[PDB]
């Protein structure tokens, strides 16, 4: 997600997390579309091969 | 022959530890982008041992 609010398109997969947990670029910090919050009684994070975090 | 527990250790886990800020000496602090600190014991939860 864009600030303007339009969504943006990318081949880079560096992610990270935000104060919020939400998943964000580890570049501009921009949020993943879905947005996907880890909760903070997470251990550990695995994500499918069909997506499902 | 006392055995007295003299307190426990504190232990410290941000939701982004990316966005820790460097310090010196291996220490970093909590910032904007880090979330808040959160306090909580160890072996509880999602915390370590």
Do not use: H
């Amino acid at each position: 997600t864009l600030p303007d609010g339009n969504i943006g398109y990318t081949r880079n997969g560096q992610f990270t997390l935000n104060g919020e947990g939400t998943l964000v670029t580890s570049g501009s910090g921009y949020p993943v579309e879905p947005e996907i919050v880890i909760p903070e009684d997470a251990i550990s994070i695995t994500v499918g091969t069909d997506g499902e975090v | 022959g006392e055995n007295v527990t003299l307190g426990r250790v504190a232990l410290v886990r941000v939701p982004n530890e990316q966005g820790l800020d460097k310090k010196g000496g291996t220490q970093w602090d909590s910032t904007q982008f880090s979330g808040d600190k959160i306090w909580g014991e160890s072996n509880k939860g999602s915390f370590g041992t």
